[PDB]
Design a protein around this ligand. Structure first.
Ligand SMILES: Cc1cc2nc3c(=O)[nH]c(=O)nc-3n(C[C@H](O)[C@H](O)[C@H](O)COP(=O)(O)OP(=O)(O)OC[C@H]3O[C@@H](n4cnc5c(N)ncnc54)[C@H](O)[C@@H]3O)c2cc1C
Ligand SMILES: Cc1cc2nc3c(=O)[nH]c(=O)nc-3n(C[C@H](O)[C@H](O)[C@H](O)COP(=O)(O)OP(=O)(O)OC[C@H]3O[C@@H](n4cnc5c(N)ncnc54)[C@H](O)[C@@H]3O)c2cc1C
Ligand code: NFU
Ligand code: NFU
Ligand code: SF4
Ligand code: SF4
Ligand code: SF4
Ligand code: SF4
Ligand code: SF4
Ligand code: SF4
Ligand code: SF4
Ligand code: SF4
Ligand SMILES: [Fe+3]
Ligand SMILES: [Fe+3]
Ligand SMILES: [Fe+3]
Ligand SMILES: [Fe+3]
Lengths: 240, 278, 392, 240, 392, 278
């Protein structure tokens, strides 16, 4: 299986989370063929020499099996737009890796004006422009979640992946998802697992109910992914 | 309709430590397990409920036997699971929860998006039986305005024999019919399909066993290994559930009553278009 | 002569291009290294947000060095508001930054290993890096709450006390890291000193030489009193690149007293450890030695830390809307500066960030001149560039 | 045309906004027949006398033409649930009047626990349970907007009402709607009309772009209703 | 004997029921008036939210009297934090409350007009009410920012200065309102004094009599030093209703020194204007006279207001997490109390509201006793009940 | 493709007040209209752009002639429209804006959800022609790094004759090609289909008229009544646009060029699934 890491308007933290499989990363990289990742390999190098110029380019290779796409798309940057469409064209399976790619995340707050590209102001999750096959939320998703997603993809564990295939259809996330879909619907039982899932500590349990500190929410989607009163597929009931 | 989920064995048991038994109205299995683990290095932290003088609860990461003995309505136990493995540094964490909280724990272990380096640190997951929960002020109405007892005068509360029980610090014991408490239940409990905490390593409750004893389901290899260590060390007394009264038949009835009732609510919600877990 | 364009460059973080003018033998006459990463614009969107959101947001500049930005941000806001973090909060905050650098420097050594580490050694080498990174990230997770974007880094200090047990676990791990670091150092130093790539290519003696000075304020943390921020001026790409290239650059051009400056491990080593070697290989060498400095300081902090010490100031987050707070931190890749004006309601009036690699990009442009273009990417990587950092 | 005001878990402010047509209210009430409104009329009174009890009930009348439904539904209150379904059953046209009814509004933050009904914790917009034909956002919508909606309904001005018919399909609103659908999509031109629309002053224009003070947002939907880069039907181009 | 249940009652705000035990002639022996409105639970969901959100949220208790809750909330939080609103902010805040009451009292007169105003007079009567309401709401829009939920009511004072021109427009309108109020008073007083409904029904002399005292702290604003909050205790429905009825009630039961108390215009008139008349018609009469008191005070405020005076305190919203702040305001329907504990970050630790109609509901239960059940709703309406207010 | 929207008349005009003409590079129609209205009670407040010494703008409710004379990149004019009618008490408000801002104004008047008691207070709605806008720092790059002039040294900026113009306080005048500024445009401007502010009461711009004069479209009855009052009072000088050079043909070309270009962008966005107004 040929895999690639495509980095759009991200921070590389989702790749570092993959690197935080530590020694196990070598096992992972031996179960797949990493064919593209600007941070890690010198692929795919194409040289175009003319009389006046040598152009040494690194291109996305064709025939990728799984593309791990991190970061959002900058609508005002031509290269950002070209790369997201090229990733889709060249890959059979596109994963929106992390909140930036899956739902915008922190880049939802971008609004332009900063040097040296003040025109850069509009950032969108990749699924606003291309078909996404699987989406991993979080900022970043844990190493464990990534291991599970890769293992399931290699073993054809479609049942395990269904929750992430379903997430790929939704390009917005927010702490108020817990209110709209759980608390307001007479489903919240006060386990507090959403609070423990949140990377910014934006959720506080008060009197058995989640209180979202909205100005701290970075729209990562980890809490609604966790809440067992939203998704609780039967496969979770199979224990050792 | 499966009554208990999957399990390896089911027994009646109680703590051998008589001081533990004094602090618990039932067999004291959770405290015995926590204390045995801490004292032998099988657990390095355990999640407990730290209530105030007003029965208002707060989850806490306990690391000593004394703290467990002090902690013997919703308490969001899973909300401290990340703290437990970060600033508390726990690598063999004990978790306790109602069935819904054990459900949440299995979910976070299987899809650990926001749970970096948490799942492998969970060394014992203990579930307690649960029929329903109440908002605090709902329970307050039950005890104070239907049973006539001040909350601060409460030393033990219990459910059994078709009644809710309040044991006063001053010696009194008052009880009412369970039907009078139904209007005050957390209505989110009415989609709950799990009575015996079917996804725990070890599940324990009072029902099925005589006074001072607990029905214990051993379910997973992690649970079985732990429980066998406590039995071999003498930390628990164990009897076959088939030998004790009322026995497993009462657990089955109550579990099936819950699943039947709440299955009806799930279907009703679907009919009118309200969401349910899937 | 010929133009050589390399795009994207590889085995650093983020998106950059090299545009080089070379002679007939391939020797670089004029160099340009530049970020072409989109500008997410953190400095602009922080205006109007509460102070507490700053460390949360700026951590997302970069997932390699996020502690550096959260630290500079909270230091800038504390300076704006005249908040003093309590002593044990400051110890925990420095420990978090050291943990981050204890993962970053081995990560960089991994990124350059295809150039310097023989293939037969690569598996063993990477296992050692990852063993060290595990310990660095453990420190950041325990003290900062998450290794990648630490929510405990806050205006006023650090949000959480650790327990005495966690302190002892960190100490045990630091001792193991020190043993691994010794092995890593004794392995890599001879390679960096050999001036040879793992394919036999001899490196030119003057590789990566430049004539710029250094900025570093502290060996492991940061000290705002060691820089005169009034002498730091940010110019535009049009001041250092040709027009056709300047319009592509995403970053500002920081200067000190009107001149470019290098930041990073070699800057720190020149200022504090009497290490004056010039050139690109000396950058790798200083980074390698710095790993030992870092873990030694972490253990010193653990010895001094009172786990029952107050970690957050009770001082309110109230500014006067006028003072330009200054927050500096020695990030893995160098002197990192955030600035903030805070109003009486604790909201952000103005925000600015001048990041380590922001300084080094125009230095690299000059450093690649004078040697063959085939060595230009090796000079780039000696600086451990973080482009998402440089661009924010 | 027979009209009714149905009050669920609201504050009656939407009805007061209608009353702030001032003297014109008498004109409005003469262009329609107000057949039900507990705050205003003693309808529909039904008496059931037995030997031991006299029951004097006010019921929703059948055959309502337009129901103005204000407030959200409390899932744990049997009367609240009965009334929302009865309103739908008895009325040909249901209007979700105001944010509480249309998208939950302030009641999105309810989470239970308060005397003397601590079980009351789950509040939903009416469209989570019944078909809604038109939705008016705002907290409250202005008197002018209400006049326009009633006039259009009486004159069959379906074109004017289309924007509110479309809104009736969406039961969530939030200031981040401006980010997700306008700023992030390279559409915000900085007019600042969203800021002027907001009842809580949660939107501040900074450097030509909207900044939402999320902890002040009450999820009323007025801002995204206003934004002309979302909806700008051609009928608005017809000026005097 | 018979049970009489009236449900819902009409021509007041919100959802309530009357449950009455009557004798063979229909005279009420035991009365119960109770809210059955769902509990939105504002006091509970405010815990953990910032102080600034309190006035925004509690305004949504009720769209008739929202200023009253925003005012009590900000006064409670200011008391918790020892903030003093500046004098011109306090003038604007009281003016906003008066504007709200200047719309509410005519609205109530409209709601009861089917009982008291002849059909041939109804159109003219309603036009006058609406002319007065227009002026009341204009004041709230100008000073509070919106007539229905005023965002300018804030912890520290009032958010916006008005201009001198807006002050003069309000003054002109107040003078017109005073003329309309004179006409309204001379029209309604003879009707209320006639003890006759517009259909000829004679009202019993002792209609609505009760034996409870009054709470009012001020004629137009509020004064926390005029009530001993330690003597206010909230009991449960089970303390005043039979069990079958108590389980239906949505409100708490406020008491002062262990006794029920009436609040509202007649309470204020008894405390400040030597108006001691008992019974339900005296409630209508005091409300009618109070309209004149209100507009006179508004004009007095306009005279005293400096439109360039500071309107917001610069004092920070910092509490100690211990003090129970007290905010009281004379709402249109009576003494309105909010309480708050605020922590050092300006967040809400505890919140409580005891609203005017919360007090009056158990008073009404007793007041309807002793007269025919056909008059029970007329006694209810004399109290101008706001059930969403009472329940919050 | 309709070029100008609907209108009653189109003329060339300029302020008769020579002091106004000095403060404006064009005919000074907006200032003349504002001042005439304030001085005669036809307007009681007017929205203006109050820039700082750095060309950074802020909308403001002006109520005096002097304030208008002081105010003669995005400025969010509509953001103060509610303040104007609340604490400022305006009942005859003058509004100025680019076409998109006039579009926003007509939208809020037609669907006034969050605009209680606002629409009837708008007494004159003036639109100014607009081809594109820039982020401040984009314009800063144009003037400082492509024209070589400090922002604080700017006293007049203009667009015309295919160029962008900077008039220095010290006398210099610099200009560059319009194609060099295109990369810095606000890309939200690229879906804009309105050049002459087609929905205003009165629309005005420099194009079509000679130096010191403005092309003015009178569109609505409110606009026509106001304009006729100013003409009858002598507050404006007016000439037929057919008599002036370059004339209406230049306005038509520029408007149609905008609509053609931006129509292409709208279709492109639809093709790739990005949203557009409808
Ligand atoms: C709402 C509720 C309903 C229950 N219903 C039944 C029932 O119908 N039948 C039955 O047999 N048992 C029921 N139980 C369980 C029973 O009350 C005992 O907890 C059980 O027998 C285990 O107690 P133990 O003596 O083994 O443990 P102990 O040694 O007494 O320790 C008990 C442990 O429970 C934890 N705990 C306390 N409150 C909570 C809480 N709210 N959430 C999570 N953990 C908590 C404490 O932290 C402690 O560690 C219920 C428990 C709850 C909270
Ligand atoms: C971005 C932009 C592009 C333009 N492009 C063209 C063009 O291509 N062709 C053309 O003929 N005219 C164009 N104009 C309009 C032109 O610059 C003049 O504003 C117009 O001639 C009217 O000026 P006046 O002399 O009649 O008014 P004046 O008496 O000079 O008053 C001008 C008014 O404009 C207001 N104003 C200033 N800046 C803004 C702003 N950013 N948003 C809203 N209102 C503002 C001021 O508050 C003032 O009241 C453009 C204007 C802008 C802002
Ligand atoms: N080290 C580092 Fe960062 Ni990813 C850079 N450059 C930050 O300050
Ligand atoms: N008046 C009034 Fe309210 Ni709608 C009541 N009761 C508030 O305090
Ligand atoms: S999701 Fe978070 S960690 Fe991943 S790229 Fe985006 S900001 Fe970085
Ligand atoms: S995880 Fe879901 S059920 Fe548990 S507390 Fe959070 S919202 Fe409620
Ligand atoms: S509340 Fe926390 S977990 Fe949920 S979306 Fe926001 S940042 Fe992510
Ligand atoms: S009944 Fe179910 S949802 Fe309710 S507390 Fe018990 S386990 Fe949780
Ligand atoms: S939308 Fe606002 S005004 Fe209308 S009922 Fe709800 S809270 Fe009251
Ligand atoms: S109304 Fe729409 S276009 Fe105008 S500023 Fe707000 S979001 Fe931007
Ligand atoms: S930002 Fe304002 S207008 Fe928009 S939804 Fe929130 S409260 Fe309503
Ligand atoms: S081009 Fe259109 S969107 Fe851009 S500023 Fe001008 S009128 Fe507004
Ligand atoms: Fe038992
Ligand atoms: Fe910067
Ligand atoms: Fe209350
Ligand atoms: Fe001109």
């Amino acid at each position: 299986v040929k895999i690639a890491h495509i980095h759009l308007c991200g921070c590389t933290g989702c790749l570092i989370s993959l690197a935080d499989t530590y020694e196990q990363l070598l096992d992972i990289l031996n179960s797949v063929e990493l064919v593209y990742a600007l941070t890690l390999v010198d692929e795919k190098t194409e040289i175009r020499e003319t009389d006046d110029k040598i152009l040494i380019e690194r291109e996305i290779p064709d025939d990728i099996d799984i593309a791990l796409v991190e970061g959002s798309v900058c609508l005002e940057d031509e290269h950002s737009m070209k790369d997201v469409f090229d990733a889709r064209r060249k890959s059979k399976i596109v994963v929106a890796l992390g909140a930036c790619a899956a739902t915008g995340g922190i880049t939802r707050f971008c609004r332009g004006g900063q040097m040296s590209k003040p025109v850069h102001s509009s950032f969108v999750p990749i699924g606003d422009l291309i078909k996404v096959d699987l989406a991993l939320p979080g900022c970043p998703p844990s190493p464990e979640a990534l291991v599970n997603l890769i293992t399931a993809a290699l073993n054809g564990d479609t049942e395990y992946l269904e929750i992430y295939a379903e997430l790929a259809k939704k390009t917005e996330a927010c702490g108020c998802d817990l209110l709209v879909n759980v608390i307001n619907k007479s489903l919240c039982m006060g386990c507090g697992s959403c609070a423990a899932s949140c990377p910014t500590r934006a959720i506080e349990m008060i009197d058995g109910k989640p209180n979202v500190l909205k100005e701290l929410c970075i729209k990562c989607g980890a809490c609604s992914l966790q809440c067992p009163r939203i998704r609780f597929p039967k496969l979770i009931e199979e224990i050792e | 309709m499966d009554p208990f989920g999957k399990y390896k064995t089911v027994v009646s048991a109680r703590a051998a430590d008589k001081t533990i038994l004094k602090k618990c109205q039932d067999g004291g299995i959770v405290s015995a397990a926590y204390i045995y683990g801490l004292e032998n290095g099988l657990l390095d932290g355990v999640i407990v409920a730290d209530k105030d003088d007003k029965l208002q609860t707060t989850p806490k990461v306990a690391t000593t036997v004394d703290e467990v003995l002090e902690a013997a309505t919703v308490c969001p136990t899973i909300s401290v699971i990340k703290s437990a493995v970060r600033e508390y540094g726990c690598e063999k964490l004990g978790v306790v929860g109602t069935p819904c909280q054990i459900i949440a724990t299995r979910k976070l272990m299987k899809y650990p998006i926001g749970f970096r380096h948490v799942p492998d640190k969970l060394a014992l997951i203990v579930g307690i039986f649960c029929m329903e929960n109440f908002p605090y002020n709902g329970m307050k109405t039950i005890i104070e305005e239907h049973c006539g007892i001040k909350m601060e005068d409460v030393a033990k509360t219990d459910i059994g024999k078709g009644k809710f029980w309040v044991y006063s610090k001053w010696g009194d014991v008052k009880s009412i019919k369970l039907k009078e408490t139904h209007p005050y239940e957390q209505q989110s409990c009415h989609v709950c399909m799990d009575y015996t905490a079917e996804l725990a390593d070890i599940s324990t409750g009072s029902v099925g066993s005589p006074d001072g004893w607990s029905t214990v389901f051993i379910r997973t290899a992690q649970g079985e290994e732990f429980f066998n260590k406590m039995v071999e060390a003498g930390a628990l007394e164990v009897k076959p559930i088939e030998e004790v009264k009322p026995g497993l038949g009462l657990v089955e009835k109550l579990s099936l009553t819950k699943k039947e009732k709440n299955a009806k609510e799930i279907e009703h919600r679907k009919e009118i278009g309200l969401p349910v877990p899937y | 002569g010929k133009i050589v364009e390399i795009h994207p460059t590889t085995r650093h973080e983020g998106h950059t291009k090299l545009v080089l003018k070379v002679d007939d033998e391939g020797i670089v006459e004029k160099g340009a290294y530049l970020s072409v990463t989109p500008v997410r614009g953190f400095e602009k969107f922080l205006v109007g947000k509460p102070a507490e959101f700053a460390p949360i947001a700026v951590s997302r500049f970069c997932g390699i060095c996020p502690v550096a930005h959260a630290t500079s941000a909270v230091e800038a806001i504390e300076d704006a508001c005249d908040i003093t973090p309590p002593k044990d909060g400051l110890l925990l905050r420095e420990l978090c930054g050291i943990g981050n650098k204890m993962h970053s420097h081995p990560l960089h050594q991994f990124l350059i290993s295809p150039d310097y580490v023989p293939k037969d050694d690569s598996n063993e080498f990477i296992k050692r890096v990852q063993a060290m990174r595990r310990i660095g990230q453990y420190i950041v997770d325990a003290v900062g709450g998450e290794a990648i974007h630490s929510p405990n880094i806050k205006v006023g200090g650090m949000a959480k006390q650790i327990t005495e047990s966690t302190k002892a676990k960190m100490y045990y791990k630091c001792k193991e890291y020190e043993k691994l670091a010794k092995e890593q150092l004794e392995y890599l130093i001879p390679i960096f000193e050999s001036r040879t790539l793992n394919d036999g290519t001899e490196l030119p003696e003057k590789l990566g030489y430049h004539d710029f000075g250094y900025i570093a304020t502290h060996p492991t943390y940061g000290d705002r009193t060691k820089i005169d921020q009034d002498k730091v001026v940010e110019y535009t790409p049009f001041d250092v690149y040709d027009k056709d290239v300047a319009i592509q650059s995403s970053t500002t051009v920081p200067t000190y007293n009107g001149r470019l400056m290098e930041v990073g491990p070699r800057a720190r080593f020149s200022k504090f450890f009497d290490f004056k070697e010039k050139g690109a290989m000396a950058l790798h060498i200083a980074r390698a030695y710095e790993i030992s400095v870092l873990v030694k300081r972490a253990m010193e902090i653990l010895d001094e830390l009172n786990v029952n010490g107050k970690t957050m100031s009770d001082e309110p987050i109230v500014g006067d809307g006028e003072k330009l707070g200054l927050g500096v931190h020695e990030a893995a890749r160098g002197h990192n500066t955030h600035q903030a004006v805070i109003d009486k309601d604790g909201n952000i009036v103005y925000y600015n960030a001048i990041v380590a690699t922001t300084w080094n990009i125009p230095v690299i442009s000059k450093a690649v001149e004078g040697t063959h273009y085939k060595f230009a990417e090796h000079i780039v990587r000696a600086y451990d560039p973080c482009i998402s950092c440089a661009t924010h």
